[PDB]
Amino acid sequence: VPGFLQQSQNSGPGQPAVWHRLEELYTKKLWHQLTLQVLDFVQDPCFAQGDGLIKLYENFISEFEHRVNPLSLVEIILHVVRQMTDPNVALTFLEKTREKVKSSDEAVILCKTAIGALKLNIGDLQVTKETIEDVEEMLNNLPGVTSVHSRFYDLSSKYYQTIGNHASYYKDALRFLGCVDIKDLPVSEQQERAFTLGLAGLLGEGVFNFGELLMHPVLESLRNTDRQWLIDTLYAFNSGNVERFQTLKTAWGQQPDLAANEAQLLRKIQLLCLMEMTFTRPANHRQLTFEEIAKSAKITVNEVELLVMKALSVGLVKGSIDEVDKRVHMTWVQPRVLDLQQIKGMKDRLEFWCTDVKSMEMLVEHQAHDILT
Amino acid sequence: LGLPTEAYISVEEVHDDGTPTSKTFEHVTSEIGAEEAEEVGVEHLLRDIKDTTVGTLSQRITNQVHGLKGLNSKLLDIRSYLEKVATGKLPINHQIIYQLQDVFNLLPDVSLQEFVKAFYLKTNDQMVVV
Amino acid sequence: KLKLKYYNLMIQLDQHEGSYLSICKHYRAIYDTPCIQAESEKWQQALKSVVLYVILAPFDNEQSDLVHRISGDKKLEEIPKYKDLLKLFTTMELMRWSTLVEDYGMELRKGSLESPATDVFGSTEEGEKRWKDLKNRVVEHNIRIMAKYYTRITMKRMAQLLDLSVDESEAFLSNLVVNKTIFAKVDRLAGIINFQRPKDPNNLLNDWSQKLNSLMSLVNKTTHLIAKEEMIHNLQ
């Protein structure tokens, strides 16, 4: 057993130097500073034929030590699988590490995420959704680790790559956008990451605008690195609606995948302006006319029916349409976004209600304060 | 400002931002009540103000309390709305700020038109009673 | 399971003359025989024949949750005719009746399964009865949403929207208004016709109880405002 790690002690120049300490770590029988130093060598890029041979000794360690968490065993097996190049024998060994390790901390979440990360070549679609569904089910208690939820996004994003319900990708990427605390990775990756995220999130039919989360503070720095045609057209889907120049500009910027959802985006902004036209005016004065909708949406008078009534089916407005003069009577509204100047005028609309009730009610009981006693 | 204490229930709401699940206790509305003997003790222990009296002082004092305590409620609460934006960032703002404040902007809500019809209709309602 | 097969004998009696409602739950009773099958053509033709009689039965509260019980099955959506049949039912809106003839005129050429065309268009008089019934169901589907949105409308715009003559509009508005499903107001000479609305006390229920029903959310404003405020402030 000692000679098995002695033949692998020298991986090249400078390796036996720190390995003289590495072999002195198990002589004192401490496997933890040994864990951090070996994992550092595993994290250290190599051929790597060193970790493939020594993983049996690390397995022998896990045998009689019976303790060390499978987390480090998943971190080493994801480095070894890259050099093994065969996912099948990696699945047999990883599932072996899943069944042979048990601890108070749940090992099913880290093993299923490792299986899902190694399932990209299977290729997909067979057992994927089953184990991917099991990840977050076992993650519900108790999600205090915060580390594995990013791996849940990894297997869920690769689950989305089949396309795959675009509307769901923003929810999964939201889970990632909130999972990782500090980015600690180059923005050059996150600029296209938030780009295709903006594409799949905007082209989704379930979300017509959601201009609020477009302003989310952690993704706005990623949008600053992005070209401003995407941010400006996201403001067109935030307010707009037409703005025919910007909805075409996103076709100038992004050629693919837009040709299918282009007409869907046009329908989404045609139902988007209906809330903002009655919301922008002080009003209400919530009754509009056919000339207002047909001129703004630049659609024929026969299709404004389908237009406004589809928005009634979306749920953003409950209003009714007066078809004698072809007027449109809006009811309620769908709140979207709105600014510190609005908090100020909000205090004006409030304080006016304050002095109203204060004055009048203090006048009410001013009359009857005498007779009470 | 009113009914004392408070109630918070333990629940996991996660978030719309998909953060790892964290627990922000949801507010449970609390009300004061009693059954029989717990009514006997306190109802004799008041010995303070007239009871009720029904119809005269009751509703109008409630018009003072619920009205004026509603004024300083939202006042100090809107004072926290601006103060949190001025100091305490982050978040702070986001999240619910834009949607909640737009819910405040849901209804201004004045006439024309049908609200003018409700006026003299309400006048037609006071007809019968007077 | 011969007694379950006798249902296929009794569907001839219930569907024969006057009852399109009796086939609702009973065509779901004959649907249990393909569940044991072990059959292909009769099974697939049972899926379409049981999903295509929705137009036959008149509109009723039972017809909504009825088609909602069969909606969502993994075997049902395989037919594009179910996609069109579901498209018209959900969210309503408007679709050209000629396009509805295109999708329902190809079902004679479509198949595989000939059984829906045998029950619907297999008989000349019964097929024509279901042609005018289909006309009454699609125009009532238009009236259902439009009447709830009126307020008022115009006669000429109703003629071009319903794709039928003004006298046919008055005919469809006549037999729908005697059904007392929607109380209308129709005058063709002035051109201004209107459907609904309450027609309530209305000076107490409508104006008072609804306005101060919104004042429920107005007095609950600050209550749930400070709630969600503290919610977003605590977690970050």
Swiss-Prot record, chain A:
Keywords: Acetylation, Proteasome. The keyword Glycosyltransferase does not apply. Signal peptide: none annotated. Pfam families: PCI, PSD13_N. Transmembrane segments: none annotated. GO terms for biological process: meiosis I; proteasome-mediated ubiquitin-dependent protein catabolic process; ubiquitin-dependent protein catabolic process. Residues 168-335 form the PCI domain. InterPro entries: PCI_dom, PSD13_N, PSMD13, WH_DNA-bd_sf. GO terms for molecular function: structural molecule activity. The modification N6-acetyllysine is found at residue 295. It comes from the Eukaryota. SMART domains: PINT. GO terms for cellular component: cytosol; extracellular region; ficolin-1-rich granule lumen; membrane; nucleoplasm; nucleus; proteasome accessory complex; proteasome complex. The keyword Acetylation applies. Component of the 19S proteasome regulatory particle complex. The 26S proteasome consists of a 20S core particle (CP) and two 19S regulatory subunits (RP). The regulatory particle is made of a lid composed of 9 subunits including PSMD13, a base containing 6 ATPases and few additional components. Component of the 26S proteasome, a multiprotein complex involved in the ATP-dependent degradation of ubiquitinated proteins. This complex plays a key role in the maintenance of protein homeostasis by removing misfolded or damaged proteins, which could impair cellular functions, and by removing proteins whose functions are no longer required. Therefore, the proteasome participates in numerous cellular processes, including cell cycle progression, apoptosis, or DNA damage repair. Belongs to the proteasome subunit S11 family. This is 26S proteasome non-ATPase regulatory subunit 13. The gene is PSMD13.
Swiss-Prot record, chain B:
The modification N6-acetyllysine is found at residues 74, 84. There is a cross-link at residue 50 (Glycyl lysine isopeptide (Lys-Gly) (interchain with G-Cter in ubiquitin)). Coiled coil: none annotated. It comes from the Eukaryota. Does not bind a metal ion. Component of the 19S proteasome regulatory particle complex. The 26S proteasome consists of a 20S core particle (CP) and two 19S regulatory subunits (RP). The regulatory particle is made of a lid composed of 9 subunits including PSMD7, a base containing 6 ATPases and few additional components. Within the complex, PSMD7 interacts with subunit PSMD4 through their respective MPN domain. Interacts with TRIM5. Component of the 26S proteasome, a multiprotein complex involved in the ATP-dependent degradation of ubiquitinated proteins. This complex plays a key role in the maintenance of protein homeostasis by removing misfolded or damaged proteins, which could impair cellular functions, and by removing proteins whose functions are no longer required. Therefore, the proteasome participates in numerous cellular processes, including cell cycle progression, apoptosis, or DNA damage repair. Belongs to the peptidase M67A family. This is 26S proteasome non-ATPase regulatory subunit 7.
Swiss-Prot record, chain C:
One of its GO terms (biological process) is proteasome-mediated ubiquitin-dependent protein catabolic process. Belongs to the proteasome subunit p55 family. The keyword Transferase does not apply. It is linked to Stankiewicz-Isidor syndrome: A neurodevelopmental disorder characterized by delayed psychomotor development, intellectual disability, behavioral disorders, mild dysmorphism, ophthalmologic anomalies, feeding difficulties, deafness, and variable congenital malformations of the cardiac and/or urogenital systems. Component of the 19S proteasome regulatory particle complex. The 26S proteasome consists of a 20S core particle (CP) and two 19S regulatory subunits (RP). The regulatory particle is made of a lid composed of 9 subunits including PSMD12, a base containing 6 ATPases and few additional components. Interacts with ERCC6. Signal peptide: none annotated. The gene is PSMD12. Keywords: Acetylation, Intellectual disability, Isopeptide bond, Proteasome, Ubl conjugation. This is 26S proteasome non-ATPase regulatory subunit 12. GO terms for cellular component: cytoplasm; cytosol; extracellular exosome; extracellular region; ficolin-1-rich granule lumen; membrane; nucleoplasm; proteasome accessory complex. It comes from Homo sapiens (Human). The modification N6-acetyllysine is found at residues 1, 148. Residues 22-200 form the PCI domain. Component of the 26S proteasome, a multiprotein complex involved in the ATP-dependent degradation of ubiquitinated proteins. This complex plays a key role in the maintenance of protein homeostasis by removing misfolded or damaged proteins, which could impair cellular functions, and by removing proteins whose functions are no longer required. Therefore, the proteasome participates in numerous cellular processes, including cell cycle progression, apoptosis, or DNA damage repair. It comes from the Eukaryota.
